Design a protein around this ligand. Structure first.
Ligand SMILES: Nc1nc2c(ncn2[C@@H]2O[C@H](COP(=O)(O)O)[C@@H](O)[C@H]2O)c(=O)[nH]1
Ligand SMILES: [Mg+2]
Ligand SMILES: [Mg+2]
Ligand SMILES: [Mg+2]
Ligand SMILES: [Mg+2]
Ligand SMILES: [Mg+2]
Ligand SMILES: [Mg+2]
Ligand SMILES: [Mg+2]
Ligand SMILES: [Mg+2]
Ligand SMILES: [Mg+2]
Ligand SMILES: [Mg+2]
Ligand SMILES: [Mg+2]
Ligand SMILES: [Mg+2]
Ligand SMILES: [Mg+2]
Ligand SMILES: [Mg+2]
Ligand SMILES: [Mg+2]
Ligand SMILES: [Mg+2]
Ligand SMILES: [Mg+2]
Ligand SMILES: [Mg+2]
Ligand SMILES: [Mg+2]
Ligand SMILES: [Mg+2]
Ligand SMILES: [Mg+2]
Ligand SMILES: [Mg+2]
Ligand SMILES: [Mg+2]
Ligand SMILES: [Mg+2]
Ligand SMILES: [Mg+2]
Ligand SMILES: [Mg+2]
Ligand SMILES: [Mg+2]
Ligand SMILES: [Mg+2]
Ligand SMILES: [Mg+2]
Ligand SMILES: [Mg+2]
Ligand SMILES: [Mg+2]
Ligand SMILES: [Mg+2]
Ligand SMILES: [Mg+2]
Ligand SMILES: [Mg+2]
Ligand SMILES: [Mg+2]
Ligand SMILES: [Mg+2]
Ligand SMILES: [Mg+2]
Ligand SMILES: [Mg+2]
Ligand SMILES: [Mg+2]
Ligand SMILES: [Mg+2]
Ligand SMILES: [Mg+2]
Ligand SMILES: [Mg+2]
Ligand SMILES: [Mg+2]
Ligand SMILES: [Mg+2]
Ligand SMILES: [Mg+2]
Ligand SMILES: [Mg+2]
Ligand SMILES: [Mg+2]
Ligand SMILES: [Mg+2]
Ligand SMILES: [Mg+2]
Lengths: 177, 94, 148, 55, 104
RNA sequence: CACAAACGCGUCUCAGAGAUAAUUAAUGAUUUAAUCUUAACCUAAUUAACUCAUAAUAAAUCCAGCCCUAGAACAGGGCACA
RNA sequence: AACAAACUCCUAGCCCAAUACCGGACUAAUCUAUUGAAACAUAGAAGCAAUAAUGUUAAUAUGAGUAACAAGAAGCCUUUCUC
RNA sequence: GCCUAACGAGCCUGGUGAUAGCUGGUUGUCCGAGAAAGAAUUUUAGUUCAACCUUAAAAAUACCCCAAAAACCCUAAAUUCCAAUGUAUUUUUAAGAGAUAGUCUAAAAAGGUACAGCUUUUUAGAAACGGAUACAACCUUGACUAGAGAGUAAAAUCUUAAUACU
RNA sequence: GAUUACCCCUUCUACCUUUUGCAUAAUGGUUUAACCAGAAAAAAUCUAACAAAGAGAACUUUAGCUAGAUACCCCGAAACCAG
């Protein structure tokens, strides 16, 4: 508890770098925790006029998942400003073009809409796969737990787990598969 | 791009707004309080005739007090200490 | 208004009331007219009350000046160096008494907005939260993807 | 002296040395500086938490 | 005084209303919700027995609040009211928190 | 067309890949036949948009004067041959 | 669940919003009567209080250093030229 | 047409501070209560009466109101009228003005197109600094002052998107 | 509102007038200074004198009479008439 004044204050308002794996996660649930950590709303010392907000590094952004048919139906629209410059683009297309886009947009939508959004957008780092500049690797303090539990495919299960689960019905021997 | 014609909540064509699970909860809770309310209203202690004039003595008394309070209104007494006390304004050291 | 005026944190002069309490009001100066009606209350106050007041507060020196003035004033002056001016012009004995009491019990600090109701040196006993205080340490102290 | 620190009024310039001497006096041996917590090394605003260990 | 405070020895609180006490009087603040120290904490339900803990505060300064303006206004109804509020204030220095060994 | 230019009535040049909608097919279950499938898996044939290859731009700080196919001003290109 | 009001509790009080009309209490500044004499008191009086009338008069900005305005040439300086 | 830069009848001075039911404007602070229209009217851009309302003053009952009671063919929600009871209101007397160009919501109807943010009456309501993203009229809410307390209210994504028949 | 901190954050649709209803894209104002707009006492109420009478003549009186205090704006037509 006993620190000099300067190091105390420095330790308190210190920035932190969180790492967040994106593989098979809904960009929304991702963007939720990303948003919280960007605004520094996870700090008991939080205030809106303190700069407090932490860096968030999201990776495996290409491997993002979308529940339902959202890949087809969700359209990102924009306008160049020129007559006939209105562009609607399906999420599949946008993602195909620019790996980072989807998750970036979601986070940019969930931050508060003031000027600080632009600043705390600068503390967000997005990598399509896992390749990170060793510079950015060397700051990572801790890794946030993935917000969705990913279901294993059928080939992931151990034979122990397969024989442990009951045969529910008994097929006729005559019947052909 | 989908406009609401005229004013939002008023006319022949209105903004569609839906009922919320919240609203159903609230309304139902009120209803429950009212059902209990009209349970307790259901069985009087005294009958209709048992309460006749049962306090008519207090009621008349009250009205006598109300009357009396008004009958007392009159201009207030005027005393020498006022009209004379005003002279204290010019009091001095000498 | 608060953006309009100055402000200060809550403080005591010389940590008053810690070791011992020191009445901060130092001296009190009255100026009144023997003749003028405006000073009437102030005269009565000087007659009856001042004396008793002076016993009730040994530490304050009270200077009374009869002089030809139209507006009787009381000048409070504090250990702080602070000087506070007041007008006892056209008031009762009662009013003046209450006023002189307020003057007696004030710190002499400037009256402005006070930013927050409490003042603590060392608020923090047992620690002060920092981003790491609630985080678990790992083995070897490795970072998230770091390998050894 | 209320609210004040120690090293606010003491002004000593080499804390490590003084510590080692005081620990000789207490018959404890060798404070070892061991890095405990850190955030960003590559940043313009890093934070280090150094611990001191005796045995 | 209707509020809860986090208090420690040597400190200062500003109560927003008058108290009847001379300046310099020592006072036992009675209702105590929480007591704490580096290694332990006592919690009340919702109060600590007067035998368990005793906190004494001195009243330093009786004073009055700075002027607070309060203004009502209504568009094109020709209605303004402006009123200046001054609140009587009392500054307490809390002196000592003592804690007695009796606990079961 | 009476300035060394500007100009048309004159002269030159103008494009690849991917994507789709409607609609056609192949394999094939729920419904051991069938069946293009808001069944899977691979699939084919297929408008315009629209993205994108590709092209263009891309040397931080000499600049008084003087020239200019560069220019309202400010900028910009020249000024060692000869 | 929580979060959420001029509602309601809490600690103190000087103890409950408002247009037209209506009632009340105070009061700036002048003058007069007596006080008063580092600028006042009790009365009596009034040309008795201006963020709004395309208000009046003066003065200042903005538009704006904007629109617009002018002297034929050289020289030996009033002599030649060009119209 | 023209009669000294404006002639459906010049200009100037006086009558003159012409007269405007029409527009504009109307100057210190703080507090108490506080108003949406029945009747006439060259009247519906206004007045003058009522009903409300305000300031005083005298009084005594005032609302709320169970039976009983109020039509003849059929006929609803409901009125009228009144003891008790819960409350403190109501009535007269004396002074006064403003207001009398009305909106939406729910209800009963009429007209219209079983149209209107339409129009005409009757009963009720509202005109938040909270909610319905924004919002006059919907919903929550007996509008005081100071707190760096607390509990509550109304309130924030509405579901479905289904047709095999050899 | 705040804040260590000017901004950055958060919360608020100028003011008059006119209107059922105005942030209104309805009215008026560049700004500053100085000027610029409620006036009357019949009945009433309030205070006081004296009172079957009161008023300094003339009047009024089945508690009245006498006195005092309480009240009712500003700018603007096209016109009309005389010289
Ligand atoms: N005639 C009448 N007009 C009213 C009433 N209440 C308010 N008004 C009018 O309504 C307008 C503004 O209403 P407020 O500003 O009071 O909400 C003004 O024109 C005002 O005169 C009333 O009770 N009666
Ligand atoms: Mg609309
Ligand atoms: Mg509508
Ligand atoms: Mg088959
Ligand atoms: Mg076939
Ligand atoms: Mg390209
Ligand atoms: Mg150059
Ligand atoms: Mg709350
Ligand atoms: Mg209240
Ligand atoms: Mg009121
Ligand atoms: Mg005066
Ligand atoms: Mg005037
Ligand atoms: Mg002025
Ligand atoms: Mg103008
Ligand atoms: Mg003006
Ligand atoms: Mg200029
Ligand atoms: Mg020039
Ligand atoms: Mg210009
Ligand atoms: Mg020019
Ligand atoms: Mg010329
Ligand atoms: Mg003429
Ligand atoms: Mg006039
Ligand atoms: Mg009219
Ligand atoms: Mg108008
Ligand atoms: Mg009303
Ligand atoms: Mg007639
Ligand atoms: Mg009337
Ligand atoms: Mg009945
Ligand atoms: Mg009755
Ligand atoms: Mg009318
Ligand atoms: Mg209508
Ligand atoms: Mg109605
Ligand atoms: Mg709102
Ligand atoms: Mg209310
Ligand atoms: Mg209310
Ligand atoms: Mg209108
Ligand atoms: Mg009106
Ligand atoms: Mg509005
Ligand atoms: Mg508009
Ligand atoms: Mg505009
Ligand atoms: Mg409008
Ligand atoms: Mg207009
Ligand atoms: Mg306007
Ligand atoms: Mg108009
Ligand atoms: Mg106006
Ligand atoms: Mg204008
Ligand atoms: Mg009279
Ligand atoms: Mg009047
Ligand atoms: Mg005539
Ligand atoms: Mg005529």
């Amino acid at each position: 508890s006993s620190f000099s004044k300067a190091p105390q204050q420095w330790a308190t308002f210190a920035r932190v770098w969180y790492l967040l794996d994106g593989k098979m996660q809904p960009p929304g649930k991702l963007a939720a925790m990303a948003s919280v950590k960007l605004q520094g709303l996870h700090k008991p010392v939080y205030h809106q006029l303190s700069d407090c907000g932490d860096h968030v590094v999201i990776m495996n952004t290409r491997h993002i998942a979308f529940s339902g048919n959202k890949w087809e139906q969700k359209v990102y629209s924009s306008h160049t400003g020129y007559p006939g410059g209105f562009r609607q683009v399906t999420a599949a297309q946008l993602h195909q073009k620019d790996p980072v886009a989807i998750v970036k947009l979601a986070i940019y939508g969930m931050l508060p809409k003031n000027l600080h959004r632009r600043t705390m957008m600068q503390r967000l780092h997005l990598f399509p796969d896992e390749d990170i500049p060793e510079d950015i690797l060397k700051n990572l303090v801790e890794e946030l737990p993935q917000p969705r539990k990913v279901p294993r495919r059928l080939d992931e299960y151990t034979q122990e787990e397969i024989e442990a689960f009951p045969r529910v019905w008994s097929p006729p021997e005559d019947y052909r598969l | 791009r989908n406009r609401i014609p005229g004013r939002q909540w008023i006319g022949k064509h209105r903004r569609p707004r839906p009922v919320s699970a919240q609203a159903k909860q609230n309304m139902i809770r009120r209803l429950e309080t009212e059902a209990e309310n009209q349970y307790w209203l259901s069985r009087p202690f005294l009958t209709a005739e048992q309460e006749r004039g049962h306090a008519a003595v207090r009621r008349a008394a009250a009205f006598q007090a109300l009357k009396a309070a008004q009958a007392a209104r009159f201009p207030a007494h005027r005393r020498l200490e006022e009209q004379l006390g005003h002279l204290l304004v010019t009091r001095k050291w000498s | 208004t608060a953006r309009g005026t100055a402000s200060r944190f809550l403080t005591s002069v010389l940590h008053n009331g810690l070791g011992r309490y020191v009445q901060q009001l130092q001296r009190l100066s009255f100026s009144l007219s023997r003749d003028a009606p405006s000073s009437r209350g102030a005269r009565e106050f000087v007659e009856r009350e001042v004396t008793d007041f002076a016993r009730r507060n040994p530490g304050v020196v009270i200077y009374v000046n009869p002089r030809p003035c139209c507006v009787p004033r009381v000048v409070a002056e504090y250990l702080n160096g602070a000087v506070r001016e007041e007008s006892i012009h056209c008031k009762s004995v009662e009013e003046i008494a209450a006023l002189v009491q307020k003057l007696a019990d004030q710190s002499g600090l400037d009256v402005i907005r006070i930013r927050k109701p409490f003042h603590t040196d060392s608020p923090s006993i047992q620690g002060q939260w920092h981003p790491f205080t609630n985080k678990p340490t790992t083995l070897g102290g490795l970072r998230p993807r770091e390998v050894q | 002296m209320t609210g004040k620190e120690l090293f606010e009024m003491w002004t000593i310039t080499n804390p490590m040395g003084l510590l080692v001497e005081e620990l000789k006096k207490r018959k404890i041996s060798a404070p070892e500086s061991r890095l405990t917590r850190q955030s960003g090394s590559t940043t313009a605003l890093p934070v280090y938490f150094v611990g001191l260990y005796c045995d | 005084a209707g509020h809860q405070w986090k208090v420690t020895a040597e400190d200062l609180i500003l109560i927003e209303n008058e108290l009847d006490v001379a300046c310099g009087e020592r006072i036992r603040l009675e209702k105590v919700l929480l007591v704490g120290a580096d290694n332990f904490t006592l919690l009340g339900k919702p109060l600590l027995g007067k035998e368990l803990v005793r906190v004494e505060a001195t009243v330093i300064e009786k004073t009055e609040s700075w002027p607070k303006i309060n203004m009502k206004f209504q568009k094109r109804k020709n209605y303004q009211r402006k009123r200046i509020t001054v609140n009587p204030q009392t500054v307490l220095r809390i002196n000592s928190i003592e804690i007695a060994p009796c606990l079961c």
